[PDB]
């Protein structure tokens, strides 16, 4: 049973540094993926702002129209 010994030896050869490398790669790529996701979050919040600005502009337009109507009805006191 030499191949068993060789198996254990191959598994244990720089095993600690190898496992460290694996875990480290996992952490690294987790961080990078989180970077991508945060960028997506940026995009999303940006979209939200665009929508709010749109609705705010609409509301302001409505305000203008209502002020015009008010001025008109104030004119009609003659």
């Amino acid at each position: 049973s030499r191949l068993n010994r060789q198996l254990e030896e191959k598994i244990n050869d720089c095993a600690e540094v190898k496992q460290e490398l694996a875990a480290s790669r996992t952490a690294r790529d987790a961080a990078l993926e989180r970077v991508q996701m945060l960028e997506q979050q940026i995009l999303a919040y940006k979209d939200d702002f665009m929508s709010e600005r749109a609705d705010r502009e609409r509301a302001q337009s409505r305000i203008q129209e209502l002020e015009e109507k008010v001025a008109s009805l104030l004119h009609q006191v003659s």
Binding site: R34, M37, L38, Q40, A44, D47, D48, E52, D55
Partner: protein, 223 residues
């Protein structure tokens, strides 16, 4: 099959789906499991923003696959709640929302329990049963909030120092949120306080109806 959904907040929700499920249905399940409206959800797989009309198989989403959830600050429809103090509250709603749901949103935003709320639209007090569409509550339409000092169900809680305190609750309230009410009124943080009723420890997942705790029932608080 089951899939996973990863959020920026670290949480990884586990969902039970079929390949023929639409993205819309998946978002509905995320709603049922997290309480987030579908139109405020953005699902990402393979760098693609998933479209609600497409299915999971259309994006080759296999078993044990992982989607990414990006949350939006606003949905497609907002309504405005007007209180007597002037501050115009803004609510993210969908036309399928019942009035109880709206009151739940007002609760999540302002802390005021639904049964202490009184919503009036166009001079008519909104009933908890009907939906927003039922009252023709269109986008940007304004409701009016009337406050109630007490709810329908009160329970009392005794501290280990002999001091008892009242509490406005609902039969659906979990022990966690009861601990939150104790946290607001008395100040005791949820992780330090242990709630005891019927000679047993109260778990943070069980509702008040789970222990069938009726009104005017006294709970014993320890730490």
């Amino acid at each position: 099959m089951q899939i996973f959904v990863k959020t920026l907040t670290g949480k990884t929700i586990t969902l039970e789906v079929e390949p023929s499920d639409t993205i819309e249905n998946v978002k509905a399940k995320i709603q049922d499991k997290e309480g987030i409206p579908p139109d405020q959800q953005r699902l990402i797989f393979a760098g693609k923003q998933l479209e609600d009309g497409r299915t999971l198989s259309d994006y080759n989403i296999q078993k044990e696959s992982t989607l990414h959830l990006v949350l939006r600050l606003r949905g497609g429809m907002q309504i405005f709640v007007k209180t007597l103090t002037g501050k115009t509250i803004t609510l993210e709603v969908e036309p399928s929302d019942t009035i109880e749901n709206v009151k739940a949103k007002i609760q999540d935003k302002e802390g005021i329990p639904p049964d202490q709320q009184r919503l009036i639209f166009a001079g008519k007090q909104l009933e908890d049963g009907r939906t927003l569409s039922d009252y023709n509550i269109q986008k940007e339409s304004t409701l009016h909030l009337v406050l109630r000092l007490r709810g329908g169900m009160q329970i009392f809680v005794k501290t280990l120092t002999g001091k008892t305190i009242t509490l406005e609750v609902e039969p659906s309230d979990t022990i966690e949120n009861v601990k939150a009410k104790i946290q607001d009124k008395e100040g005791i943080p949820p992780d330090q306080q242990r709630l005891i009723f019927a000679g047993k420890q109260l778990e943070d997942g069980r509702t008040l109806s789970d222990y069938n705790i009726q009104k005017e029932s006294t709970l014993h608080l320890v730490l």
